[PDB]
């Protein structure tokens, strides 16, 4: 059972993965993705970035 995911690099990859990790309620932390549209809590709520 996966409890958390260390995210992808490109922003598109992160968006694609986050759309499913939201449905299954798994936290995601990314290390390189910087697209401004991933700061929206309504649509991407389990996404965080360093």
């Amino acid at each position: 059972k996966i409890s958390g995911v260390i995210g992808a690099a490109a922003s598109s990859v992160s968006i694609m993965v986050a759309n499913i990790l939201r449905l299954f309620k798994i936290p995601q932390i990314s290390y390189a993705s910087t697209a401004p549209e991933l700061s929206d809590n309504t649509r991407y709520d389990f996404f965080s970035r360093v």
């Binding site: 759309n19 499913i20 939201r22 449905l23 649509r43």
Partner: protein
Amino acid sequence: HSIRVDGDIILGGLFPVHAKGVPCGELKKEKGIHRLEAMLYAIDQINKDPDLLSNITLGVRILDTCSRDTYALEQSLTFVQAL
């Protein structure tokens, strides 16, 4: 919250029965009901029509999109649960 009609070959449908809210909002009488009723009518015509898919029955699996992307993603998941 999902329409079942059994048959030999099963088709799936996605229609906006409700509006975007809350995940879901108000009913759409024209964009949602008329269209799914049209799909059901077409299925009934094909099943009743001879010399087109003779002796083969078509069923339906009709779901709601609620005019949203994520909700449709969840319904697509229930489409592909078999695999």
